[PDB]
Amino acid sequence: QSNEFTYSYLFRMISHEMKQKADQKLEQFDITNEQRHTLGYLYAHQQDGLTQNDIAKALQRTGPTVSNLLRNLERKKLIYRYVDAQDTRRKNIGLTTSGIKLVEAFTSIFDEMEQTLVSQLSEEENEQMKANLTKMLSSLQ
Amino acid sequence: QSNEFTYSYLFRMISHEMKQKADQKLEQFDITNEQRHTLGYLYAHQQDGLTQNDIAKALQRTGPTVSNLLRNLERKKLIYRYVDAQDTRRKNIGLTTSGIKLVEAFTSIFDEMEQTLVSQLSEEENEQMKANLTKMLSSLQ
C-alpha cells in the first residue's frame, strides 16, 4: 500500500529517473536527438526508396534543414546514397552497416527500460496500468 | 487497450501536463518555491511554538538563509511573531490570516490535481495503481 503519495510525485519521480537513465546512455553517442530520429526513420522506411524530399515530408521539416542533417550523417558514414535496383536512373538514401548498428543500440536503451518496467507486473496488470494511464492523461488534456 | 505506448512516454506526458498546469497557477503568487515550503511548514507545525532555529533544523537550511526567508515573508505580512501564551518571555513565528489563506490556496492546486486523477479510477484501482507505481519506481532505484 502506497496511498500516502500523490500521483504528481510518483509520476514526476518515475519520469525523472527514466530520463536521467536514458540521457546518460545517449550521451555516449555523438548524435543529436534530431539525427537520432532521422536514423530511426531510415531504419523503418528505407525499403520505400527514399529521397531527401520524402524524409522532409515525413519528419515535417524544411529542405535545407534535412540537407544539413543528411550531410552530417553522411560525413559520419552512418548513411549512404545507393543506386536503385529497379531504376538505375535513381538513388536512394539508406543506412550503412554502422548506421544500422547505431539505431539498434539507441533503440535498445528504450526497449530495455520498457522491459524492466513491464517485468514488474503480470500481463493483465500491465494492460490495466497502461489503460488507466491513458485515461488519466486524457483527464489532463 | 493502450498497449502501443511505452511507459516512458506515458509517464513523461502525464508528468509534463501536471507540472505545466501547477506551474501556471503558482505563477500568480509572488512567492518562491522555498517560501512556499516555509509557509507550509508553519501551517503544519506552528502549534509547537517555533523559533528560527526550529525552522532551519526542519527545512535543513542554514541560519542566514532562514533569516532572509523570514524577512521577506514578514515584509509581505504573511507571517508574524507572537508573544507565547505560556511563557511571556518568548516569541513564536506563525502565519497571519493572509498567510493561512495563501497556504490553503496553493495546497488546493495540488489537491485539485490529485482528486481529478483519483476520480478516474475506483478505490481498488487507485490502490493498485499506486502500489504498482512504487514498485516500478523502485525497479529504477
Side-chain angles (χ1 to χ4, degrees), chain A residues 2-16 18-56 58-141, chain B residues 1-46 48-59 61-111 113-122 124-141:
Chain A
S2 292
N3 293 332
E4 65 265 64
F5 303 102
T6 58
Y7 284 118
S8 180
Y9 170 71
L10 300 171
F11 291 140
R12 177 181 62 101
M13 284 307 319
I14 286 165
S15 191
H16 173 73
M18 302 190 73
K19 183 176 188 297
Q20 182 173 5
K21 177 174 278 63
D23 275 347
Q24 172 172 15
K25 293 166 180 304
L26 292 167
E27 284 166 18
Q28 304 301 315
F29 305 94
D30 183 43
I31 300 291
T32 72
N33 294 329
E34 189 67 28
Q35 293 167 358
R36 172 161 55 80
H37 183 13
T38 302
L39 293 162
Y41 168 79
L42 294 179
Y43 189 93
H45 295 99
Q46 66 183 355
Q47 68 273 17
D48 294 340
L50 295 166
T51 68
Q52 302 178 206
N53 300 312
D54 294 330
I55 299 178
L59 308 178
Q60 302 184 1
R61 296 287 262 193
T62 68
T65 295
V66 163
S67 294
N68 283 332
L69 185 146
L70 299 176
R71 250 193 305 280
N72 181 263
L73 289 172
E74 189 155 4
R75 202 179 313 268
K76 289 177 174 162
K77 298 181 188 172
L78 297 165
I79 65 175
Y80 177 81
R81 294 172 191 262
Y82 295 92
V83 175
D84 184 87
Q86 63 155 335
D87 186 355
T88 75
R89 301 173 298 180
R90 296 183 61 88
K91 307 216 305 194
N92 292 326
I93 297 155
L95 296 167
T96 58
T97 299
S98 63
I100 287 164
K101 285 188 172 187
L102 174 60
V103 169
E104 284 168 9
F106 70 66
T107 302
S108 85
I109 294 175
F110 295 100
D111 202 75
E112 289 172 10
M113 220 164 304
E114 167 82 0
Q115 288 308 294
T116 295
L117 292 184
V118 165
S119 71
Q120 308 303 306
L121 296 185
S122 66
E123 166 70 10
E124 179 174 2
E125 279 169 326
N126 274 290
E127 296 211 46
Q128 291 163 322
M129 173 72 55
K130 294 191 162 178
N132 287 341
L133 291 171
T134 58
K135 185 177 182 184
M136 290 181 147
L137 178 57
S138 177
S139 74
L140 301 169
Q141 305 183 311
Chain B
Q1 165 259 144
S2 297
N3 296 330
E4 67 265 66
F5 304 104
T6 58
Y7 284 119
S8 176
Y9 170 69
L10 299 171
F11 289 138
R12 175 179 63 98
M13 288 277 73
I14 291 162
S15 190
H16 173 72
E17 292 284 349
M18 299 188 80
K19 185 178 186 294
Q20 182 171 50
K21 178 171 280 66
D23 276 345
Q24 174 166 18
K25 288 151 180 307
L26 291 167
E27 268 155 30
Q28 298 300 322
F29 307 100
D30 180 42
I31 303 284
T32 77
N33 290 333
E34 187 64 33
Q35 292 165 357
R36 172 163 58 79
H37 297 345
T38 301
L39 292 162
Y41 168 79
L42 294 182
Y43 187 94
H45 290 107
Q46 61 183 358
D48 299 342
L50 304 166
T51 65
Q52 302 175 204
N53 166 48
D54 298 331
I55 298 178
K57 190 183 180 65
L59 305 182
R61 293 288 255 202
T62 66
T65 294
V66 166
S67 293
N68 279 334
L69 281 172
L70 298 177
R71 254 193 305 278
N72 290 297
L73 292 174
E74 189 162 7
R75 201 183 306 261
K76 291 175 173 166
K77 300 186 183 291
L78 295 169
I79 65 173
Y80 176 80
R81 317 175 93 94
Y82 296 93
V83 176
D84 180 271
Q86 182 200 348
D87 186 356
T88 73
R89 299 127 81 200
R90 300 182 57 92
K91 313 215 305 193
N92 292 328
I93 300 161
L95 296 166
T96 61
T97 299
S98 65
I100 288 167
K101 269 67 171 59
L102 175 58
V103 172
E104 280 163 4
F106 69 63
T107 310
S108 82
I109 292 174
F110 297 101
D111 207 79
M113 285 213 65
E114 170 79 3
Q115 287 308 111
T116 296
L117 293 182
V118 168
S119 75
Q120 309 303 308
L121 299 188
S122 67
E124 175 67 278
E125 282 174 330
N126 276 288
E127 300 207 52
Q128 303 176 293
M129 172 71 57
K130 291 193 167 175
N132 289 341
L133 288 172
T134 60
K135 188 178 183 183
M136 291 179 76
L137 179 60
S138 65
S139 72
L140 295 168
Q141 303 180 318

mmCIF file of all heavy atoms in Angstrom, chain B residues 28-63, unseen atoms left out:
data_model
loop_
_atom_site.group_PDB
_atom_site.id
_atom_site.type_symbol
_atom_site.label_atom_id
_atom_site.label_comp_id
_atom_site.label_asym_id
_atom_site.label_seq_id
_atom_site.Cartn_x
_atom_site.Cartn_y
_atom_site.Cartn_z
ATOM 1 N N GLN B 28 0.874 32.909 -10.318
ATOM 2 C CA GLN B 28 0.027 34.039 -9.951
ATOM 3 C C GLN B 28 0.321 34.578 -8.552
ATOM 4 O O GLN B 28 -0.184 35.635 -8.179
ATOM 5 C CB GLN B 28 -1.450 33.672 -10.092
ATOM 6 C CG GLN B 28 -1.857 33.313 -11.521
ATOM 7 C CD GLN B 28 -1.631 34.455 -12.499
ATOM 8 O OE1 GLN B 28 -1.849 35.624 -12.172
ATOM 9 N NE2 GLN B 28 -1.186 34.121 -13.704
ATOM 10 N N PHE B 29 1.141 33.860 -7.788
ATOM 11 C CA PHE B 29 1.545 34.315 -6.454
ATOM 12 C C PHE B 29 2.988 34.808 -6.476
ATOM 13 O O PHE B 29 3.854 34.180 -7.086
ATOM 14 C CB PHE B 29 1.414 33.191 -5.425
ATOM 15 C CG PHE B 29 0.063 32.543 -5.398
ATOM 16 C CD1 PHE B 29 -0.152 31.336 -6.043
ATOM 17 C CD2 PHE B 29 -0.989 33.132 -4.724
ATOM 18 C CE1 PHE B 29 -1.395 30.731 -6.020
ATOM 19 C CE2 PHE B 29 -2.235 32.531 -4.698
ATOM 20 C CZ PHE B 29 -2.438 31.329 -5.350
ATOM 21 N N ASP B 30 3.247 35.932 -5.812
ATOM 22 C CA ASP B 30 4.603 36.467 -5.741
ATOM 23 C C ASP B 30 5.336 35.790 -4.599
ATOM 24 O O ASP B 30 5.613 36.402 -3.568
ATOM 25 C CB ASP B 30 4.588 37.982 -5.534
ATOM 26 C CG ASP B 30 5.987 38.580 -5.461
ATOM 27 O OD1 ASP B 30 6.861 38.179 -6.261
ATOM 28 O OD2 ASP B 30 6.214 39.454 -4.595
ATOM 29 N N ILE B 31 5.639 34.512 -4.791
ATOM 30 C CA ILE B 31 6.238 33.693 -3.750
ATOM 31 C C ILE B 31 7.153 32.663 -4.393
ATOM 32 O O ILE B 31 6.808 32.077 -5.421
ATOM 33 C CB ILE B 31 5.150 32.963 -2.941
ATOM 34 C CG1 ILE B 31 4.159 33.965 -2.348
ATOM 35 C CG2 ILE B 31 5.774 32.126 -1.844
ATOM 36 C CD1 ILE B 31 4.699 34.709 -1.138
ATOM 37 N N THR B 32 8.324 32.446 -3.803
ATOM 38 C CA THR B 32 9.239 31.433 -4.319
ATOM 39 C C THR B 32 8.853 30.046 -3.809
ATOM 40 O O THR B 32 8.109 29.916 -2.833
ATOM 41 C CB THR B 32 10.690 31.722 -3.912
ATOM 42 O OG1 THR B 32 10.887 31.355 -2.542
ATOM 43 C CG2 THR B 32 11.014 33.203 -4.099
ATOM 44 N N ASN B 33 9.362 29.012 -4.470
ATOM 45 C CA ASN B 33 9.139 27.638 -4.026
ATOM 46 C C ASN B 33 9.595 27.431 -2.583
ATOM 47 O O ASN B 33 8.911 26.782 -1.793
ATOM 48 C CB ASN B 33 9.849 26.641 -4.939
ATOM 49 C CG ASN B 33 9.212 26.556 -6.313
ATOM 50 O OD1 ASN B 33 8.017 26.814 -6.472
ATOM 51 N ND2 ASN B 33 10.006 26.197 -7.313
ATOM 52 N N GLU B 34 10.750 27.991 -2.242
ATOM 53 C CA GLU B 34 11.296 27.844 -0.898
ATOM 54 C C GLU B 34 10.422 28.565 0.131
ATOM 55 O O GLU B 34 10.179 28.054 1.228
ATOM 56 C CB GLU B 34 12.739 28.356 -0.850
ATOM 57 C CG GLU B 34 13.448 28.084 0.470
ATOM 58 C CD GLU B 34 13.625 26.602 0.750
ATOM 59 O OE1 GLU B 34 13.802 25.830 -0.216
ATOM 60 O OE2 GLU B 34 13.583 26.208 1.938
ATOM 61 N N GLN B 35 9.937 29.751 -0.224
ATOM 62 C CA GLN B 35 8.979 30.450 0.635
ATOM 63 C C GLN B 35 7.688 29.643 0.782
ATOM 64 O O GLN B 35 7.085 29.603 1.858
ATOM 65 C CB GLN B 35 8.662 31.844 0.086
ATOM 66 C CG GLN B 35 9.835 32.822 0.152
ATOM 67 C CD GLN B 35 9.627 34.052 -0.705
ATOM 68 O OE1 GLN B 35 8.619 34.181 -1.409
ATOM 69 N NE2 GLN B 35 10.590 34.969 -0.663
ATOM 70 N N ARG B 36 7.246 29.021 -0.303
ATOM 71 C CA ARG B 36 6.036 28.212 -0.226
ATOM 72 C C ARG B 36 6.255 27.053 0.761
ATOM 73 O O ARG B 36 5.392 26.754 1.599
ATOM 74 C CB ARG B 36 5.625 27.722 -1.622
ATOM 75 C CG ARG B 36 4.484 26.720 -1.647
ATOM 76 C CD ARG B 36 3.860 26.615 -3.043
ATOM 77 N NE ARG B 36 4.828 26.223 -4.065
ATOM 78 C CZ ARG B 36 5.235 24.976 -4.264
ATOM 79 N NH1 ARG B 36 4.766 24.000 -3.500
ATOM 80 N NH2 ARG B 36 6.114 24.699 -5.223
ATOM 81 N N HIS B 37 7.413 26.409 0.679
ATOM 82 C CA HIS B 37 7.719 25.307 1.587
ATOM 83 C C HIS B 37 7.784 25.806 3.033
ATOM 84 O O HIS B 37 7.351 25.114 3.953
ATOM 85 C CB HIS B 37 9.032 24.620 1.203
ATOM 86 C CG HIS B 37 9.009 23.978 -0.150
ATOM 87 N ND1 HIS B 37 7.843 23.742 -0.846
ATOM 88 C CD2 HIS B 37 10.014 23.529 -0.938
ATOM 89 C CE1 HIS B 37 8.130 23.175 -2.002
ATOM 90 N NE2 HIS B 37 9.439 23.031 -2.084
ATOM 91 N N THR B 38 8.313 27.009 3.228
ATOM 92 C CA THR B 38 8.388 27.595 4.569
ATOM 93 C C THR B 38 6.984 27.850 5.141
ATOM 94 O O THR B 38 6.691 27.478 6.280
ATOM 95 C CB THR B 38 9.219 28.893 4.596
ATOM 96 O OG1 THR B 38 10.551 28.616 4.135
ATOM 97 C CG2 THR B 38 9.288 29.471 6.026
ATOM 98 N N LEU B 39 6.115 28.455 4.340
ATOM 99 C CA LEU B 39 4.749 28.732 4.777
ATOM 100 C C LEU B 39 3.979 27.461 5.114
ATOM 101 O O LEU B 39 3.194 27.453 6.054
ATOM 102 C CB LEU B 39 3.976 29.499 3.703
ATOM 103 C CG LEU B 39 4.492 30.924 3.505
ATOM 104 C CD1 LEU B 39 4.003 31.470 2.155
ATOM 105 C CD2 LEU B 39 4.027 31.792 4.661
ATOM 106 N N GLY B 40 4.174 26.413 4.320
ATOM 107 C CA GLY B 40 3.521 25.138 4.555
ATOM 108 C C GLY B 40 3.940 24.493 5.869
ATOM 109 O O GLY B 40 3.117 23.903 6.588
ATOM 110 N N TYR B 41 5.231 24.585 6.156
ATOM 111 C CA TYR B 41 5.790 24.053 7.384
ATOM 112 C C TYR B 41 5.165 24.780 8.578
ATOM 113 O O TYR B 41 4.811 24.154 9.577
ATOM 114 C CB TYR B 41 7.318 24.208 7.402
ATOM 115 C CG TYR B 41 7.911 23.939 8.754
ATOM 116 C CD1 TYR B 41 8.106 22.637 9.211
ATOM 117 C CD2 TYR B 41 8.245 24.985 9.591
ATOM 118 C CE1 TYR B 41 8.642 22.402 10.481
ATOM 119 C CE2 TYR B 41 8.779 24.766 10.833
ATOM 120 C CZ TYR B 41 8.976 23.482 11.280
ATOM 121 O OH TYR B 41 9.515 23.305 12.538
ATOM 122 N N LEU B 42 5.045 26.102 8.479
ATOM 123 C CA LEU B 42 4.395 26.870 9.543
ATOM 124 C C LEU B 42 2.935 26.460 9.687
ATOM 125 O O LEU B 42 2.400 26.365 10.801
ATOM 126 C CB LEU B 42 4.478 28.372 9.273
ATOM 127 C CG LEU B 42 5.862 29.010 9.300
ATOM 128 C CD1 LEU B 42 5.741 30.509 9.054
ATOM 129 C CD2 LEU B 42 6.544 28.767 10.631
ATOM 130 N N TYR B 43 2.285 26.224 8.552
ATOM 131 C CA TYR B 43 0.899 25.778 8.563
ATOM 132 C C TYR B 43 0.814 24.460 9.339
ATOM 133 O O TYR B 43 -0.088 24.262 10.149
ATOM 134 C CB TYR B 43 0.384 25.593 7.129
ATOM 135 C CG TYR B 43 -1.104 25.298 7.028
ATOM 136 C CD1 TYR B 43 -2.019 26.323 6.833
ATOM 137 C CD2 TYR B 43 -1.585 24.000 7.116
ATOM 138 C CE1 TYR B 43 -3.381 26.071 6.736
ATOM 139 C CE2 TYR B 43 -2.951 23.737 7.022
ATOM 140 C CZ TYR B 43 -3.838 24.783 6.830
ATOM 141 O OH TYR B 43 -5.190 24.540 6.731
ATOM 142 N N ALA B 44 1.792 23.582 9.132
ATOM 143 C CA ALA B 44 1.747 22.245 9.742
ATOM 144 C C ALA B 44 2.240 22.137 11.194
ATOM 145 O O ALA B 44 1.923 21.161 11.878
ATOM 146 C CB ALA B 44 2.502 21.235 8.859
ATOM 147 N N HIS B 45 3.026 23.105 11.661
ATOM 148 C CA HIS B 45 3.747 22.936 12.929
ATOM 149 C C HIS B 45 3.791 24.162 13.842
ATOM 150 O O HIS B 45 4.400 24.100 14.909
ATOM 151 C CB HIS B 45 5.190 22.493 12.669
ATOM 152 C CG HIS B 45 5.308 21.097 12.145
ATOM 153 N ND1 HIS B 45 5.626 20.819 10.832
ATOM 154 C CD2 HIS B 45 5.146 19.900 12.757
ATOM 155 C CE1 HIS B 45 5.661 19.509 10.661
ATOM 156 N NE2 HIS B 45 5.369 18.928 11.811
ATOM 157 N N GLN B 46 3.192 25.272 13.428
ATOM 158 C CA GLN B 46 3.270 26.491 14.239
ATOM 159 C C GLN B 46 2.724 26.289 15.662
ATOM 160 O O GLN B 46 3.005 27.088 16.575
ATOM 161 C CB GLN B 46 2.567 27.660 13.543
ATOM 162 C CG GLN B 46 1.083 27.467 13.292
ATOM 163 C CD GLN B 46 0.470 28.636 12.527
ATOM 164 O OE1 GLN B 46 1.148 29.613 12.223
ATOM 165 N NE2 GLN B 46 -0.816 28.530 12.201
ATOM 166 N N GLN B 47 1.968 25.207 15.856
ATOM 167 C CA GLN B 47 1.416 24.915 17.173
ATOM 168 C C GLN B 47 2.515 24.579 18.182
ATOM 169 O O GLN B 47 2.307 24.662 19.389
ATOM 170 C CB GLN B 47 0.406 23.764 17.097
ATOM 171 N N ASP B 48 3.681 24.184 17.682
ATOM 172 C CA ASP B 48 4.786 23.777 18.543
ATOM 173 C C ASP B 48 5.467 24.963 19.235
ATOM 174 O O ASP B 48 6.156 24.791 20.244
ATOM 175 C CB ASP B 48 5.816 22.974 17.740
ATOM 176 C CG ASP B 48 5.237 21.696 17.154
ATOM 177 O OD1 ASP B 48 4.173 21.250 17.634
ATOM 178 O OD2 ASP B 48 5.849 21.138 16.218
ATOM 179 N N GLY B 49 5.254 26.163 18.698
ATOM 180 C CA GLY B 49 5.924 27.352 19.191
ATOM 181 C C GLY B 49 7.322 27.488 18.621
ATOM 182 O O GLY B 49 8.311 27.207 19.300
ATOM 183 N N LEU B 50 7.406 27.953 17.378
ATOM 184 C CA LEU B 50 8.631 27.845 16.592
ATOM 185 C C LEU B 50 9.568 29.043 16.658
ATOM 186 O O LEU B 50 9.134 30.197 16.611
ATOM 187 C CB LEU B 50 8.274 27.627 15.133
ATOM 188 C CG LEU B 50 7.385 26.447 14.785
ATOM 189 C CD1 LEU B 50 6.871 26.601 13.366
ATOM 190 C CD2 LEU B 50 8.167 25.156 14.953
ATOM 191 N N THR B 51 10.862 28.755 16.756
ATOM 192 C CA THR B 51 11.888 29.781 16.609
ATOM 193 C C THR B 51 12.495 29.627 15.221
ATOM 194 O O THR B 51 12.188 28.679 14.513
ATOM 195 C CB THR B 51 13.004 29.624 17.641
ATOM 196 O OG1 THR B 51 13.694 28.386 17.413
ATOM 197 C CG2 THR B 51 12.434 29.650 19.058
ATOM 198 N N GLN B 52 13.368 30.547 14.838
ATOM 199 C CA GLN B 52 14.063 30.428 13.562
ATOM 200 C C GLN B 52 14.937 29.185 13.557
ATOM 201 O O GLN B 52 15.099 28.547 12.514
ATOM 202 C CB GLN B 52 14.916 31.671 13.303
ATOM 203 C CG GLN B 52 14.096 32.939 13.306
ATOM 204 C CD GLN B 52 14.927 34.199 13.174
ATOM 205 O OE1 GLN B 52 14.495 35.276 13.583
ATOM 206 N NE2 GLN B 52 16.119 34.079 12.575
ATOM 207 N N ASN B 53 15.511 28.852 14.715
ATOM 208 C CA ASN B 53 16.291 27.622 14.860
ATOM 209 C C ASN B 53 15.473 26.400 14.471
ATOM 210 O O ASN B 53 15.943 25.527 13.735
ATOM 211 C CB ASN B 53 16.795 27.441 16.299
ATOM 212 C CG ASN B 53 17.321 26.029 16.562
ATOM 213 O OD1 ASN B 53 18.106 25.489 15.775
ATOM 214 N ND2 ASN B 53 16.876 25.419 17.665
ATOM 215 N N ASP B 54 14.252 26.327 14.989
ATOM 216 C CA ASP B 54 13.382 25.189 14.713
ATOM 217 C C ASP B 54 13.120 25.045 13.210
ATOM 218 O O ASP B 54 13.150 23.938 12.651
ATOM 219 C CB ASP B 54 12.059 25.322 15.473
ATOM 220 C CG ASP B 54 12.248 25.325 16.981
ATOM 221 O OD1 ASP B 54 13.226 24.715 17.463
ATOM 222 O OD2 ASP B 54 11.416 25.940 17.687
ATOM 223 N N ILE B 55 12.872 26.175 12.561
ATOM 224 C CA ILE B 55 12.593 26.201 11.130
ATOM 225 C C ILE B 55 13.800 25.806 10.286
ATOM 226 O O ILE B 55 13.663 25.099 9.296
ATOM 227 C CB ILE B 55 12.120 27.590 10.700
ATOM 228 C CG1 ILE B 55 10.813 27.938 11.415
ATOM 229 C CG2 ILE B 55 11.897 27.647 9.205
ATOM 230 C CD1 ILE B 55 10.328 29.342 11.062
ATOM 231 N N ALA B 56 14.982 26.293 10.656
ATOM 232 C CA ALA B 56 16.197 25.866 9.970
ATOM 233 C C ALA B 56 16.412 24.367 10.135
ATOM 234 O O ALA B 56 16.712 23.655 9.169
ATOM 235 C CB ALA B 56 17.399 26.631 10.489
ATOM 236 N N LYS B 57 16.280 23.889 11.367
ATOM 237 C CA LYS B 57 16.515 22.477 11.650
ATOM 238 C C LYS B 57 15.582 21.617 10.806
ATOM 239 O O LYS B 57 15.985 20.584 10.277
ATOM 240 C CB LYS B 57 16.313 22.182 13.139
ATOM 241 C CG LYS B 57 16.772 20.794 13.574
ATOM 242 C CD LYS B 57 16.471 20.553 15.050
ATOM 243 C CE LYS B 57 16.934 19.174 15.502
ATOM 244 N NZ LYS B 57 18.414 19.025 15.435
ATOM 245 N N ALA B 58 14.337 22.064 10.663
ATOM 246 C CA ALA B 58 13.329 21.312 9.915
ATOM 247 C C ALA B 58 13.480 21.404 8.389
ATOM 248 O O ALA B 58 13.287 20.414 7.685
ATOM 249 C CB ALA B 58 11.929 21.735 10.337
ATOM 250 N N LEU B 59 13.808 22.588 7.880
ATOM 251 C CA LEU B 59 13.962 22.769 6.436
ATOM 252 C C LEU B 59 15.354 22.359 5.941
ATOM 253 O O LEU B 59 15.638 22.423 4.742
ATOM 254 C CB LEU B 59 13.664 24.213 6.038
ATOM 255 C CG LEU B 59 12.294 24.716 6.500
ATOM 256 C CD1 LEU B 59 12.047 26.139 6.025
ATOM 257 C CD2 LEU B 59 11.205 23.772 6.007
ATOM 258 N N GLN B 60 16.208 21.918 6.863
ATOM 259 C CA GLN B 60 17.593 21.571 6.535
ATOM 260 C C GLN B 60 18.331 22.709 5.815
ATOM 261 O O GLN B 60 19.005 22.485 4.812
ATOM 262 C CB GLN B 60 17.664 20.276 5.708
ATOM 263 N N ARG B 61 18.214 23.924 6.338
ATOM 264 C CA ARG B 61 18.927 25.079 5.777
ATOM 265 C C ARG B 61 19.730 25.786 6.872
ATOM 266 O O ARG B 61 19.520 25.536 8.055
ATOM 267 C CB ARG B 61 17.940 26.057 5.138
ATOM 268 C CG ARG B 61 17.244 25.517 3.897
ATOM 269 C CD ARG B 61 18.198 25.443 2.706
ATOM 270 N NE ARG B 61 17.940 26.503 1.734
ATOM 271 C CZ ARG B 61 18.293 26.451 0.451
ATOM 272 N NH1 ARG B 61 18.921 25.382 -0.025
ATOM 273 N NH2 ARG B 61 18.013 27.466 -0.357
ATOM 274 N N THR B 62 20.659 26.656 6.484
ATOM 275 C CA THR B 62 21.437 27.392 7.478
ATOM 276 C C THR B 62 20.653 28.568 8.078
ATOM 277 O O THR B 62 19.596 28.968 7.574
ATOM 278 C CB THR B 62 22.737 27.939 6.907
ATOM 279 O OG1 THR B 62 22.431 28.941 5.932
ATOM 280 C CG2 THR B 62 23.579 26.817 6.280
ATOM 281 N N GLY B 63 21.182 29.122 9.163
ATOM 282 C CA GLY B 63 20.540 30.245 9.822
ATOM 283 C C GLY B 63 20.341 31.473 8.942
ATOM 284 O O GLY B 63 19.236 31.989 8.849
#
